[PDB]
Amino acid sequence: CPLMVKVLDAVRGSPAINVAVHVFRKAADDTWEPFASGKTSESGELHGLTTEEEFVEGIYKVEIDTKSYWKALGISPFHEHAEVVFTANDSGPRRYTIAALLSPYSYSTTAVVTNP
Amino acid sequence: CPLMVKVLDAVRGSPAINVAVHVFRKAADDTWEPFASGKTSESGELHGLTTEEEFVEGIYKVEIDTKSYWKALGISPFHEHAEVVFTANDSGPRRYTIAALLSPYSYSTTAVVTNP
Amino acid sequence: CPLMVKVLDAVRGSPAINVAVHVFRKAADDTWEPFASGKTSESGELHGLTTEEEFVEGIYKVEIDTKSYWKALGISPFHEHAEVVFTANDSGPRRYTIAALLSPYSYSTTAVVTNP
């Protein structure tokens, strides 16, 4: 996995399960092109989004569907989603973990970037 | 003042000064239309973005130019910017503060929604 | 006002009101001596803790009674309290704001240190 997404629920102290995630890549015409998508597992993690070959240099947007998550639990949250936008692989291939910690009116997001 | 933005620097323990902030409103054709913008003050705050009359219900995006902020400090950042996307809802009287706490590889954002 | 405390509720998106806060100073015998205390206001803030004359260099602990706050909302929390431990340092003129952002299973704290 060059790209992994991990989501935690700060209300429950648990992984955030079945959270939809959409990844986009900025295209040559400056539009966001769909890149990959999936749902977090029972561990809060989403693996297998992409491959080293496919995950070329670019500007990527990871959209985490936080509103849907909260609504399914009976909470009416503030944000529509969490968007994480970043340049990847500009100095060669890296491994990226995009973590998000969710509360109904607040979230944090962190990147952990390692060189394989 | 129905909408205020406040930005903090977690590395220096200080307000984040002179940070560019752009607000957008979602248009009927589903595109993001410029709405308001400014730069944070010495206190890390951006006031005067809008008025009660203009700030109607809808979907808004607040984009905080974090990357330029870090680059001005000589510190290599991860994110292109921080994006905060939410629905403004009339539910009796409301003031929205969008707070952001910035680190080079991490940020949090919180909505503080109060009735004057 | 050299020392202020501000507390936010990430679940409700609001100031955290009526939160007990105790400040301690480390004594020569290495024990924590009561220094100041109060309850956060409607704005989530606790002012008037100390004066410039009393707030001498030393090691301080700010204890925020998070557990009682959550229990008053009916929400089961993880932490007994949030503890913020730091050295006050004279380095020209300084004001310290100790900010805390609370969720049931998570909190952040930030120091905003400014020169008036």
Place this chain on the structure above:
Amino acid sequence: CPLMVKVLDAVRGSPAINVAVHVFRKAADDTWEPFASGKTSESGELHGLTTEEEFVEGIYKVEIDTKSYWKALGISPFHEHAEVVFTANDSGPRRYTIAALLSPYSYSTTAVVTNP
């Protein structure tokens, strides 16, 4: 592992390596008794602190030596340490992950609690 500690560096976007961690348990005389200690690995993780048998009900304090971490990297940080205080195993054995995300003037801490 009934108790694991994970620490990340928000400046570098990397695990926080070789961070000292001390765990205490509140004794019958209301003093903090040493329970376990160790250092984070290359992954930012500290495993093997305790066993299910040893990790009885109680009030525990996890002290993360953040000041030492930052100073070894040439940063003069705000906090002395991060202290995480909580009741454990009050409704039976659980698995606890105590995570901390560090910046020089700010940290967040989260607990992930699972039932084996």
